Design a protein around this nucleic acid. Sequence first.
RNA 1: AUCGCUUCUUCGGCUUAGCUAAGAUCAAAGUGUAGUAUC
Lengths: 119, 35, 71, 141, 62, 48, 96, 58, 108, 76, 48, 48, 47, 29
Amino acid sequence: MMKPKWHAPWKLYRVASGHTGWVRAVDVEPGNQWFASGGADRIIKIWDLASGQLKLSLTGHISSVRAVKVSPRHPFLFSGGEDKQVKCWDLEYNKVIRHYHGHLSAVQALSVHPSLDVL
Amino acid sequence: EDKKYYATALEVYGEGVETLVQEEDAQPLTEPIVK
Amino acid sequence: KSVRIWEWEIPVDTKLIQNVGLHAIPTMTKSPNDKWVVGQCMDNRIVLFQLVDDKLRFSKKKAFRGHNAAG
Amino acid sequence: QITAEQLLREAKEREPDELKEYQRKKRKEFEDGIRKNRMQLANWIKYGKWEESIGEIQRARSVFERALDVDHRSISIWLQYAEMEMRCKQINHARNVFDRAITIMPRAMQFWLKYSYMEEVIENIPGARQIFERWIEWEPP
Amino acid sequence: FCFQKIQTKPQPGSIESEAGIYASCFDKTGLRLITAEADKTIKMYKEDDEATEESHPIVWRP
Amino acid sequence: QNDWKIPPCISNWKNPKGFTVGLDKRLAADGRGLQQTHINENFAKLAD
Amino acid sequence: IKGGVWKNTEDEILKAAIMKYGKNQWSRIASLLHRKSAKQCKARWFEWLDPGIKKTEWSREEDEKLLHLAKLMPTQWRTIAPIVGRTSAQCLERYE
Amino acid sequence: MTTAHRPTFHPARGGTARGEGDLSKLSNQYSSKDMPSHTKMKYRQTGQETEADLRKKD
Amino acid sequence: MLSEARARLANTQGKKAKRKARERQLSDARRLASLQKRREMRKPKRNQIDYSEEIPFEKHVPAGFHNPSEDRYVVEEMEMRREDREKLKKKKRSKLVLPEPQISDREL
Amino acid sequence: DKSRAMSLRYAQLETTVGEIDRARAIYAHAAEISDPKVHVKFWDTWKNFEVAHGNEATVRDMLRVRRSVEASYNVN
Amino acid sequence: KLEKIAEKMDLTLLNRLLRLIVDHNIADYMTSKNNVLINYKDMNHTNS
Amino acid sequence: SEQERQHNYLKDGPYISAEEAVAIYTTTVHWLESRRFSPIPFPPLSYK
Amino acid sequence: VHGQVKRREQYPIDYINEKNKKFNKKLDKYYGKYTEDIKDDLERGTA
Amino acid sequence: VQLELENLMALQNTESALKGGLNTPLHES
RNA sequence: AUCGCUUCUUCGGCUUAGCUAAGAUCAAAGUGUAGUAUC
């Protein structure tokens, strides 16, 4: 090995309790204002990054959420389910407007291409 | 009367840490994330 | 897997011999004296019947398996 | 008295076109068994072994090449495939199977032991040295 | 080099099995970490500052 | 290798092979013996 | 009809039935025992025939505990039965 | 022995339905959910803070 | 009831397994009858690949350094077996717990 | 076989010193790996102890463990 | 609405109250009968 | 929840403690005495 | 290689004969360490 | 045991307080 | 002081094919067919 760069210790300061099932996503908005999280309670909850306040719950998924990404180019949030559905959420209406159908069993990661309109 | 069993010790770490129980949403579902 | 005794000009089953021991009999030979009738079984067996007994529960009084045939 | 033992003991005690057409029945039995199960690899080995015996060894290769596509990290299959080629006396095929096996899984010890032994029993011993020399390049432990 | 091991303690009524983690993201500055937890909580981590660099050091050890 | 010496499951309910697995092993899963019962001595104060 | 005293063969068929199907199938186990069917098989197993049912003599401390608990509880016998683990019938006939 | 009620000991793999890479095969049936939606993209506005604007600020 | 118990303890099978076992027996019986009629009097299909006509889904062995054309070839109960040999064959303790002596070592 | 013999040996010390309450637990701890059907010399020496140094409330305690322990062997 | 009244009836006391009027022999029947063991399907528990 | 509730009563349970238990008991005795009630006898052998 | 194959080929009633016997052999291996106390209560006759 | 048997029988056997009578003795432990 | 084939015993390794409201539920008797023993 060579010379570890020194990095400051990491410390804890939140526990946000409010999912009614395991949490298995986080993504942070491009704006750095809020992050989304998705849970085994099939609900997506949007949290405010500084205050930790909760300010949405989005109840579209059918059985479990576990992928969330916030697009760095569009006002959209994408999410993927163990219910075999990938959904697009429109962050100007908080409703769902796209479904991507073809997965044959549980989705468990998604990524949003940094410069193409491709998911 | 059967009551409670749990939290207080971890709430001592709560002296260090900000614990939020957050069962309802701070804005209605019509608030659009500002178009 | 039954032996049915039928009457001349009569289509109905006058007598039914039915037993689990009955099986497909590819060849049956009758003695010229009408005393005995011989039946060959596909599992290399021979069973003898009396033409007048009609003991419909079926029987195996005498049987032989010494032939090396394969049905 | 008729307690546990005697009840369950009593319950226990109750307890050549024809050959060609037989062979067709076996192939269907294997192929449909493969179709459903796929990861069945013990039966995939049996189908390979079965075809071999018949001198249908040309087909048995096809079975093992299909079997390796399913698993490929298959160390049971790779052993069985080489050992099939050895008993058939196919030894250049057996060499090719080992050269693939050790290339694909260089740190499965079993192939290098078996392969060096095959070449040694053939008195290839220069080639048996080269196998050990090639093996040591992997810094095996 | 590894220079923190944090063991999460799960929030009341869950302790032994549920402690697990499965999400992480950094904020866009890279100064807060958010983790998602099998104890049904989100936790957020932050960097200590108070007297750190002199107390902590790392040497060379190649 | 011993640390993952998983005991075989013995159900109180399902049994699709129909096996007989009966008296001792089937109770050995039952675990009934472990929770002892004791009672607050307030009950003696109440009675008397 | 159901009831009456238990033979050997009914206990032994009950044990044997408890081996294959048993610990809560008992409606199915009654299919093997006529005349003793649904509730009575379960009640025979748990009250009499279960292992660990401790069919031996009553010692000093068990008799002490039983009289102590009869004074403490009044008539609670299903609760008293776990503590002395000599069960409900064994407590009551011993107490009387 | 009962065995037709099998669990997923051996799960199937994708990439083999209608048209998945096959797309000349894709077939002319398409009707219900796929046909009509959102054909014009919404690009996020300038000043989403994220890469270049965050460095631009402290 | 002993006889009903023994039978019901043995049965171990569903309806389908018991019935299809007869269908195996009855298909074997039809195989014997239909074979013999074929023997003494002497299927077109498209719904399956015929796995005997040609090597199914043929997967070729890759090339390798060696010659393989060179090689050539030609083609040309433990329970029961015990029986006679078997016929021929002819713990924890508790801790000792004691009360403390009345005359301790100081007193002695 | 010798642990029973050592139990008799140890009981003889405790009974000459007069630690009779300890002697019972020596015998009682030995009685559980003894049977009254062939080890009669053990039960006789305990019985001769309990009639000498014992009383009704513990003689009956001896007879309880005796019938308990024989039941362990007498599965017939 | 007094709500809980059935549960909190705490049979130790109830026997004493019942002991007064329902001449004691019947009082032990009534309170001992409440004690009995509750079964649903495969869940069993004693109604202490 | 009922098994919890019954189990907790053996552990925690005797809630109507000393004072309340004797208070309501004595209250009933004063009341029933003031009625000049009589305890309902065990039903006679040949009660008409 | 035939010699290698031939070496590799070598390594109460409560049960249906093949399957349940092999299962009960397996059970005694894992459970037997813990089970014997309950079995002795059974062999005693639940006394 | 037998001293405690007598004690509790004087608890269980009694008629009720509405049928006035002598308090049968009780014993300490 | 060196030497071989076989039989036997004996040790370790050597697979319950989901789910739910335990999925739901508790007639027995008499007539017809098959199996075993005797003249």
